Amino acid sequence: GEWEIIDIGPFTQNLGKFAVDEENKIGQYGRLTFNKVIRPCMKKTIQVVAGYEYQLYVYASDKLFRADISEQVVAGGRKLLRFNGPVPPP
Amino acid sequence: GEWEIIDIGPFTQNLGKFAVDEENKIGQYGRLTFNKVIRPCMKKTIQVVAGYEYQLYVYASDKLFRADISEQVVAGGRKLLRFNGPVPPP
């Protein structure tokens, strides 16, 4: 639950474009036209996941082997979670 | 690059089954028959990735909204990386 303000501009301005698009795909606020993302833009840490590489000694056909197995963690894509409004300026 | 021994048994024994199967699917050690995973079974941390939830103030159709956007991180599946041998007992 750690928080962090990120400065506006390119990245956040494309988060707003993203947010408006995916909202229009449900559409039941009508058809919205993206304008701008204003301060403050907040970033909450909701998880920390570790990727692992297992190293095993394995008997197969009663021969011994060294196998390495990854359990990689993937940064997936952006998904719009909530979209409510209108709201007062912060 | 942090290391950790994990005790053998169910989980590691299924990592060895996994490792032998996915090896047979390239097959060019022939056809191997899984027997057992022995100590020590090692676990290396190869990454730490955080999932995020962005909270934005967005003007759309000159109305202000509160949008929340997740950038979830996914624990993907196991992939056999390397498989060499035979080797001496450790």
Numbering used by the authors:
A (entry chain A), B (entry chain A): 2 to 91
Please give me the paper's original passages concerning this structure:
Here, we engineer the hydrophobic QVVAG hinge loop from the domain-swapping cystatin, stefin B, individually into the β-turn-β motifs of the single chain variant of the sweet protein monellin (MNEI). In domain swapping, two protein molecules exchange “domains” or structural units connected by a hinge loop, such that intermolecular interactions replace the intramolecular interactions at the dimer interface of each monomer. We show that introducing the QVVAG motif into three different surface loops of MNEI results in domain-swapped dimerization, generating topologically-distinct domain-swapped dimers of MNEI. We then show that engineering the QVVAG stretch simultaneously into two different loops of MNEI creates two swappable domains in it, resulting in the formation of a double domain-swapped dimer.
The QVVAG segment was next introduced simultaneously into two different loops of MNEI, with the aim of designing two swappable domains in it. L13MN was crystallized, and its structure was determined by X-ray crystallography to a resolution of 2.3 Å. The atomic structure of L13MN revealed a domain-swapped dimer, which was constructed by a novel criss-crossed arrangement of the two polypeptide chains contributing to the dimer. Both loop1 and loop3 acted as hinge loops, and adopted an extended conformation in the dimer. Swapping via loop1 results in an exchange of β1-α1-loopA-β2 and β3-loop2-β4-loop3-β5 sub-domains. Additional swapping via loop3 splits the β3-loop2-β4-loop3-β5 sub-domain further into β3-loop2-β4 and β5 sub-domains. This results in a reciprocal exchange of more than one sub-domain between the two L13MN polypeptide chains, forming a dimer where the β3-loop2-β4 hairpin from one polypeptide chain appears to have “inserted” into the neighboring polypeptide chain. L13MN is the first instance of a designed double domain-swapped protein. The parallel arrangement of the two subunits in the L13MN dimer results in the stacking of four QVVAG stretches, generating a small hydrophobic patch at their interface. The number of contacts (including van der Waals contacts and hydrogen bonds) observed at the secondary interface in L1MN is 15, whereas the same in L13MN is 66, indicating significantly higher integration in L13MN.
